[PDB]
Enzyme design. Structure first.
Site, mmCIF file in Angstrom:
data_model
loop_
_atom_site.group_PDB
_atom_site.id
_atom_site.type_symbol
_atom_site.label_atom_id
_atom_site.label_comp_id
_atom_site.label_asym_id
_atom_site.label_seq_id
_atom_site.Cartn_x
_atom_site.Cartn_y
_atom_site.Cartn_z
ATOM 1 N N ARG A 1 0.835 -1.193 0.000
ATOM 2 C CA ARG A 1 0.000 0.000 0.000
ATOM 3 C C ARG A 1 0.872 1.247 0.000
ATOM 4 O O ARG A 1 1.854 1.329 0.745
ATOM 5 C CB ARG A 1 -0.936 0.023 1.214
ATOM 6 N N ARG B 1 -8.601 21.330 5.537
ATOM 7 C CA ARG B 1 -7.526 21.769 6.414
ATOM 8 C C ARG B 1 -7.781 23.192 6.891
ATOM 9 O O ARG B 1 -8.398 23.999 6.191
ATOM 10 C CB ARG B 1 -6.164 21.703 5.707
ATOM 11 N N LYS C 1 -13.154 3.683 0.197
ATOM 12 C CA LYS C 1 -12.857 3.845 1.612
ATOM 13 C C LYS C 1 -14.028 4.568 2.262
ATOM 14 O O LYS C 1 -14.329 5.713 1.906
ATOM 15 C CB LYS C 1 -11.561 4.629 1.817
ATOM 16 N N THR D 1 -5.964 -2.554 11.346
ATOM 17 C CA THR D 1 -5.783 -3.094 12.686
ATOM 18 C C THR D 1 -4.508 -2.531 13.295
ATOM 19 O O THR D 1 -3.475 -2.440 12.624
ATOM 20 C CB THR D 1 -5.723 -4.629 12.675
#
Ligand SMILES: [Mg+2]
Ligand SMILES: [Mg+2]
Ligand SMILES: [Mg+2]
Ligand SMILES: [Mg+2]
Lengths: 497, 497, 497, 497
Positions: D55, D97, D243, D301
Site C-alpha cells: 500500500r 484543512r 474507503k 488493525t
C-alpha cells in the site's frame, strides 16, 4: 433409531389434480405375480400403471408355468423397452403347519388342554394335534404362546416332553387342518433354505435372470451368509433380501442388515410374532436403519385387499401407502391376494398416484440435511461426490442426476441421499441395470462398454429428452469416475444446435 | 402448511411389553355408540378400555332409547367416577339420496344416458332416476361428476335443465334405491341444520348435558356462526365441531376453523368428494392447522372394521391409528360399524395400546421446539406462562401439570404445546370438566368454587396420588391465575409428613 | 471450549445516538481506585459514569489513606443511594523481582552470559544480577526462558546450580533495578498469600465491608481452598476471585474455577507468561467456561491507556471493550494507569457507552438457546424456574425480572441465562446486595427481613417506577421461593389505581 | 445485518506453540510502505513475515522515489517468486484543512466564538481561522459540529454566512496550523478524484502494474462509477476499493458496495465522523455485508502502533487483529505509522501469528452452513459448483481447492464460502493473478494459455508438492469450466509412480 421426515402440504396440491405420468414416480412398486395377473396384456397394463419389480414364489404352480411366467414377463418387456423389470424370487424357508384331523375340523374350547405331538402322521382331534415342526418341544418352554391358523387360537405351553408338548387353549375357535403355526419370541430351528429351494435357485432361478432372492424368515446374519455361501460365484451378482418375520430377526436386525443387500417387510408372519400395536414401531425402525445405511427396503402395503364391493380403497389403505413412502421406503409392495383376485392394475394405479402425491409433499432440502446430520463424520471421496451431486441438483433445480456406474455403487450412493429428481443410471452390466430398480428414484438404461464417458453422457441426454425426462433449458448433473482419482461431478445444460 | 413430528423408536420398546393402564394415555378416544355397545356393563367395559367421549347421531332409533341411551351413560359414569365422559351429538345436515325404482334395482350400463329428475315421487329405471336434492340442476354444470351409492357409479353431467339433468354413465354397476349421492367440487345448497336437528339440539341435546355438536357437511364459516346463532345463550357453552366432508370445506378450512371450537375428520363423504390419493394430504394438513391454532381435532381411524374372521387388526389399521397420533390428532375415533358389530371393546382396547406406543416414541423436546418455531412472535402473557409450564415440566421430568381453570382456557393453552405428562385440569364448571376431554392429555376433575388456590392444589395432589398419577418424590407443575396480573407457575414436590 | 455469540447490527443503531442512562447498562465496570480518582466528588462522578465495583491493592499507600479511601467510598455511596458499590481487594501474591545494581543500570548485550543468583543482597552488573525468587534454580531448567522488566529481555537458562543459574541473553536492552521477572511455563513455588496479606484480609479487609478478594497468581485449586481455609467463618461470605496470570493457572483452569466464586482476567503477568498471539484464545476460553458454569468473570480492557494528546480512545481500545462484552464478560475493568492519570471519569463514560451499544446489538433469543443447548441435561428445579423467568421475560418483553433471594443464588441462576432486561435482586443480607454486582445485569436493593413476599414485590415495583426501571403498562417477572417446594414464577403488570 | 462466527478454542491450541509457515495463512496482510520499509532487504523480510499487498499513497515523496519504490518491489518479487504481490494505490480525495496563523499557534478557549472564513490566505488567530473547504458555509448548518486537529476541538455552528461561519468553541485546546478538519453527518462537496490524482492514475499508476485503487472518502455510488468512468478501458482491469470514512459512506454503503470491487476500513477520518462507541458496529456490519456479497474487505488493525518501549504488542492490539479475522475480514492492514517507524517486520510477523491462531479456531462446518443459510435461494450453476468444492473439501479434508480461472470469478465464488484449505487459483491473466490476493485464502500461480485443463491440474499439483501445499496421500479438489455447460468439480488424490 431416531427418525424424521419433513412434509410440506399445500391447499393447492389437495385441489389441483395430478396428470404426471405414473412411471416417473420415485417410489418403485413390487407386484406379486398371481394367476390372473399374467396375461401378457395385463403385465403390460401393470407396467403402464407403475410396476417396477415382479415378485413370485415357487410354492405353487408347475415347473411349466413357472417359466411360462418368465417368458411372458420377458416378452412383456420387449413390448415396453423403456422399462427394465426386476425379478424377485421369494423363498419358502422355515414353515410350521398343524397336522390332519379325524373330523378335519375341531372346536377347541377355551380352557381345555391340547397336546401337540411331533408324529406328523397322527390324525388328531380336539385333545391332540400333530405339528410339522419336529423340534417344537426343544424350542418352546412352559409359558410360551403357540399360535394356530393365523393366530385364530393361542395356546400357552404347560408341559414340554421329548416328542410332544401340552398346552392350554386360551380362546375357543374352530380349526381346519394343515393350518400355519407361529412361535412368538422363539427361534425356529429349521434350515433357512431347502434342498428344493437350493436347486430352484442354483439351476432355475439364476439361469432365468433372477436378480433378488427374498429369503423368508431370516433370523441371523449366519442365515444370510449361509445363503450367500451356497449361491457361489454362479450367483455372486444376485441381491439377498432378508425377510424379517419374527422377533429373532428384529433382535438381530443390525447384523442381518450388515450382511444383506436390502430388506423386505413381508405381510405375513410378523403380524403374529409381534403384537399388532408394536408392528408399526418395527416397520418405521427398519426403514430408518435401512435409510441410514443406504440399503433399500421393500414395505408391504395394503390396497384393495378386501372388496365385497367395487374397487375403491379404504382410507386406512391410502394412508398406509402414503406413510410408508413418507417413512422412507424405497419400494411399496402389492402382495398376492392384494391384487384383489380381480383388480391388480387398479391397485397399482392407485398406489402410483399415492406415491406421486407423497413424493411431491416432501421438503427435500430438509430431508437432505436430516440425512447428512445422521450419517457419521468419516465419509469417503465417493460418498462426498455423490452427496455433492444431490445438493447441487436441488440448489439449481436440475432435472436429472446422470450416474455412470457398472457395479451400481455410484447410483446407490446417490439414492442414499434421496434427491428430488430422477437418478438416471447408465451401466454396461445387465446385472446392474436390473438390480438398481430396488432403490428409490433410480431408473437404469443399458449402454455399451468401451465408450468414452462424454459420448455416453450426451447419448443419455438425447434419450432423456426422448423419454420426457429433460427438456431444453434444463440443467442435469453428470457424475462418473466413482471407483480414484477420477471422482467427478459436472453440470451440463440441455441445448441443441 | 408445513408439518413435522419427531419419533424416537428403540429396539427395547419393540420387545418389552406395555402394562401401563390404558386410561393414562394422552390421546383420547371418541367411540360411536351403536345398538350393542349400550349394555351398561359394556360402556363400563368401554371406559376401562379407553373411551373418553361418547358419539351418537339421532338419525335412527326412537326418542325413547335416545334418552335410554343417555341415562345408561350417566349411570355408567357413576360406576366409574374417575372418568368424566364427553357427550358429542352428530347432526345429519345436508344429505342427497336417489329415488325409488320400479324394479327397486337397475343395472346402469357404462356409456348409457341417465336422467336425474327433481320430482322425488318419480319411480325410476335405468333411464331416469329421481334425486332428493331439488336444486341439483342449479348446482352442477356440464362436466361435473355425480357419484351414486358410495361412488359405485360416476356420471358426467351432459345437460342441465330446470327440473332435471342428463348424465352419461361412466361405469357399469347395479344400484339399489335411496342410495347416497355426492357432488365433488360442487357446493351443496341445503340448510346446514334442519328444523328436526334444531329442536333436537335446543330442547333435547342441551338439557341432557351434550357438550359437542359435530356439524355434518360444514362448507363455510357462515354455517358455523349460523349454527352458533340459533343455539343462543341456552347453548353458549357447547362446542361446535365442524365436519369437513367435501371440497368446499377444505377450500374454506382456515375461516371455518376460525369460527370453530374443533374439527372432526369424519369417515364418510370426504372419501367420495376428494380423490382417495389426496385424502391423506387433507387429513395431515387439517391436523397441522389445528395443532398450530390450539384447536382440537378428532380423526376417524379404522380398527377391526371388516372381519370375516376373528378380531385381529390388519397392519393398515394399526398404522392408520399410529400415524394419526403421530400426525398430532387430539382424538382418534371409532365409528359406528367399526365396532365390528360385535367387538367394540376389543377395538378400543387395541387403539389405546397403539396410542400408548405412539405416544411413548415421541421426542417431546423436539416437538415442543417445533411448535414454538411455528407460532407467531406476539404471544400473550397467558400463553407464555402456559408455555413455561410445559418446558419446565419436561426439563425436571415433572409427573403432572396441574392447571386451575374455570372456562378451560388455561388447559387449552397448555395442551397446545403437547407436554409429555398429563394435564390435570381443575374446574368448578361442570361444562368445562366435560368439554376439555377433546384435548389431548387433559384429564379433568371437578372442584368446589370459592376455594383458596393452595387448598385446591394439594387436594388435587392427594387425589393424584390416589389415582396413581403421581408418587412421593415427584415434582408437579401448578399453574393458575391465568385470566392479570395473576399469571403464575409453581413447582411443588410430592411429600407427606 | 465451543463458543458463540449472536450479534444483530442495524444501520439505525449506527446513526441514531444513544441517550439511555449509563447506569442502566447490563455490563458492570470494575474501576481501580488510584491517587487522583479519590476526591469524593470524583467517585460520585465515577458512579454517574458507570462504576459498579471499586478495586484497590494495598501494595502502596499508607494504612491511613487505605481507610481514608474506604470512608470516602462509604460516604460517596450516601450521596447516591440507588447505587450499591462492591469492594474488591487485590492481593499481591507471589512476585519476582531483580536485585540492585552497581550502576543501577546495565546494558545486557545479546549473546552474553548472565548469572542470576539467589543472594538478594548481591549488588549486580551485566554479568550477574540477583533475583528475589530464592527457589529460582529449583524451578527453571535448561531451555526455560526468563523474562526481565516486563519482558524487555529474555534469557534462556543454560545452567542450574544450587544458589544460581546461568543464562544467555537473547536480546540486547538496558535494565533498571528491582524490575519484575516472569518464568513462562514454570510453576512459581511461593506462598499464595502473605502474612502481610493474611492480616490485611482478616483484620482490615473483612471489617471494612470488602466483598471480593482478587487472588493474584492463582495456579491450582489448592491455592483457592488454602485461601478459603484461612479466611474462616469470619470471611465465609467473601467471594474469592482467582487471577489467572500464567500457564499453570490456564492448565488447571477447570479445577480452579470449580473452587472459585469468579474469575478476573488481569492486565499484567499473563501478557508475559503466554505469547501475545495466544492470549486472546485464553481470554475467550475462560469467558466461555465461566458463562457455562454460571460463574462471573472480570475482563481487563484498555481505554485511554496511553494519551500523549487529548482523551479520545483508539479504535483498538473501542473494539477491545466491545468484543469483551460480546465474548460474554460480566464486568469490564479499568486498571490503575488506564484512568490515564488524569481522565478516569471520561474513560468509564466511554466504556459505559460501548457496553450499551454492544448490549443493544445482542440477539437474546439466539443467545438463550445457545446457552440452553450447551448446558447439561439434568438441571434442577431451581435452575429450570430461573430459566423460565428469562424465557418468559423475552417472549412477553418484560421490563424486569424481580428476584427475591437472600444468599444471591436465585439471582445468579437467572444471570447465568443472560436476560435482555435488568435483574432486580431483593435481599435482606447486606453481604448479598454487595456481592451480586459482579454478575451481569443484576441490580440489588436491600429490603427488610420477615416480610411477606407479595409486599416485597410491589414495594420493589414502586421503587422500580421511581428509578425509571419500569413504567405503567409494563409486565415484570417475579421469582421467589428458590431454595422446595416453593419454586415459583409470576407475571404481574404495572398498574396503579 | 445479522452476524455470526463460530469459534472452537481448545486448551491444546493455547499451550502448543505454532510453527506453521507464516505465508500459509488464509488472512492476507496489506502493509503500507513507508520511508524505512523500503530496503529491498526489508521488503523481502516483510514478504517472509506475511505481506501480500503493498500500500502506498502519493501524498508525499517525489516522482523519483515513487517509481524507485516500484522497481524495489518489482525486484523484491524476483527474489521470492512464490509470492505474487498486489499493488494498491491510495488516493487523497477530498480533504479539509485549517489555515495559517499569526502566532502559528492559538489557544482556543471553551465558550469563545470562532469564525471560520473561506479566504484561505487569511492569517488567523483565536477569533477567526481560515478553512480550505470553500463550500463549508453551504454544507454545515447551525447545530452542526466541526472538528479540528484530529478532533482536538469541537465547534458548534452558530451562524452560516456566504463566505464564513460562526462557531462556539466547546472545549479548550491549542491548535497548530494547517490541521485537518471533519464535518460529522455532513456531506463534503469536493471532487472525489483530483486532476493530480487522475493523471497519477491514468499515466503512472496503471502503467506500473497497480491493481487496486483505494478511493478515499467515498460517499455515494456515483463517486465509484465516476471514478470507473474516467479510468476507461485503459484501467478496466483495476479494482476500485471505496474507503468508507464518514456518515455519508455508511448511509449509502449498500449501493456503494454494489458498484465496488471491495471495501477498505481505513484508520483515519471514520474515528472523527462517528462516535467512537459506534465505530465497532460499523466495522462489523460492513464486514458482514461484504461477506454476504462475496466482496473482499480490508480492515485496518493496530499493532505496535505506539511504543515508548520495546516492540511487544498490547492486549487490545492483539484482540483487535484477532477479532477482525473472526469478524470475517479478508485482509488485515498495517497502516503507515503503525510500522512503528522502526519495527514493520516485527509487526507483520505478530499479525501473521495472530491470523494463524484465529483461523485455526474457526469451526468451518458451522461457518459454511451459516453462510449458506444467509444467501438467497436462487444461486447460479457457477456458485453451486463453487459451493460444492468447499463442502466436498471439508468433508474429505482435502488439502487444496485448485481453481482454474482467467477473470478470477471462479476463485472469488469459492472464497465467498471460506474454505478451511487454501484456494490455489491458476490463471493465464497477469491482471488476475495479482488481483485475487485481496480475497482470503486465495493463492495465485500464473500459467500459460492454450493448455489442456488436465495438464494444468497436475502441473499445479506438482508445484503444490514443491511448495509444501500438498503431500502424497492427500486429496485435492479441482474446479474449472466455470464460465456452460462446462461447470465441473473433480477430486484427485496425490500419488506419484
Ligand atoms: Mg415365511
Ligand atoms: Mg354428512
Ligand atoms: Mg500477580
Ligand atoms: Mg480521506
Amino acid at each position: 433409531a431416531s427418525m424424521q421426515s419433513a412434509a410440506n402440504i399445500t391447499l393447492r396440491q389437495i385441489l389441483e389434480p395430478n396428470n404426471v405420468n405414473l412411471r416417473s414416480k420415485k417410489t418403485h412398486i413390487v407386484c406379486t405375480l398371481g394367476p390372473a395377473a399374467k396375461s401378457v396384456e395385463t403385465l403390460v397394463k401393470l407396467i403402464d400403471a407403475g410396476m417396477d419389480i415382479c415378485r413370485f414364489n415357487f410354492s405353487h404352480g408347475s415347473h411349466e408355468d413357472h417359466k411360462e411366467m418368465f417368458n411372458n414377463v420377458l416378452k412383456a418387456q420387449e413390448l415396453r423397452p423403456n422399462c427394465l423389470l426386476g425379478m424377485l424370487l421369494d423363498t419358502k424357508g422355515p414353515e410350521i403347519r398343524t397336522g390332519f384331523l379325524k373330523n378335519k375340523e375341531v372346536h377347541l374350547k377355551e380352557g381345555s388342554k391340547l397336546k401337540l405331538v411331533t408324529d406328523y402322521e397322527f390324525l388328531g382331534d380336539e385333545t391332540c394335534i400333530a405339528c410339522s415342526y419336529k423340534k417344537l418341544p426343544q424350542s418352546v418352554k412352559p409359558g410360551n404362546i403357540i399360535l394356530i391358523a393365523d393366530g385364530s387360537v393361542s395356546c400357552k405351553v404347560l408341559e414340554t416332553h421329548e416328542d410332544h408338548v401340552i398346552t392350554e387353549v386360551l380362546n375357543s375357535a374352530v380349526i381346519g387342518e394343515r393350518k400355519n403355526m407361529n412361535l412368538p419370541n422363539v427361534k425356529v430351528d429349521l434350515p433357512i433354505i431347502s434342498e428344493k429351494d437350493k436347486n430352484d435357485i442354483l439351476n432355475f432361478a439364476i439361469p432365468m435372470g433372477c436378480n433378488f432372492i427374498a429369503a423368508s424368515f431370516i433370523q441371523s446374519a449366519d442365515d444370510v451368509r449361509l445363503i450367500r455361501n451356497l449361491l457361489g460365484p454362479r450367483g455372486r451378482h444376485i441381491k439377498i433380501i432378508p425377510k424379517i418375520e419374527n422377533i429373532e430377526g428384529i433382535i438381530h436386525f443390525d447384523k442381518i442388515l450388515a450382511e444383506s443387500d436390502g430388506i423386505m417387510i413381508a405381510r405375513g408372519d410378523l403380524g403374529m410374532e409381534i403384537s399388532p400395536e408394536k408392528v408399526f414401531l418395527a416397520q418405521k425402525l427398519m426403514i430408518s436403519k435401512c435409510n441410514l445405511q443406504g440399503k433399500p427396503i421393500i414395505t408391504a402395503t395394503q390396497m384393495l385387499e378386501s372388496m365385497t364391493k367395487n374397487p375403491r380403497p379404504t382410507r386406512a389403505e391410502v394412508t398406509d401407502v402414503a406413510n410408508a413412502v413418507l417413512d422412507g421406503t424405497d419400494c411399496v409392495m402389492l402382495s398376492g391376494e392384494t391384487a384383489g383376485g380381480k383388480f391388480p392394475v387398479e391397485a397399482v394405479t392407485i398406489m402410483s398416484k399415492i406415491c406421486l402425491e407423497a413424493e411431491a409433499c416432501i421438503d427435500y432440502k430438509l430431508l437432505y440435511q436430516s440425512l447428512v446430520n445422521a450419517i457419521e463424520t468419516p465419509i469417503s471421496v465417493q460418498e462426498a461426490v455423490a452427496r455433492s451431486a444431490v445438493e447441487t441438483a436441488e440448489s439449481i433445480q436440475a432435472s436429472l442426476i446422470i450416474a455412470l456406474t457398472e457395479t451400481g455403487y455410484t447410483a446407490r450412493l446417490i439414492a442414499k441421499y434421496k434427491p428430488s429428481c430422477t437418478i438416471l443410471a447408465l451401466s454396461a452390466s445387465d446385472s446392474t441395470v436390473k438390480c438398481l430398480n430396488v432403490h428409490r428414484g433410480v431408473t437404469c438404461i443399458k449402454v455399451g462398454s468401451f465408450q468414452g464417458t462424454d459420448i455416453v453422457i450426451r447419448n443419455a441426454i438425447e434419450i432423456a429428452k426422448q423419454r420426457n425426462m429433460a427438456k431444453v433449458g434444463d440443467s442435469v448433473i453428470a457424475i462418473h469416475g466413482i471407483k480414484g482419482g477420477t471422482n467427478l461431478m459436472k453440470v451440463v445444460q440441455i441445448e441443441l444446435e
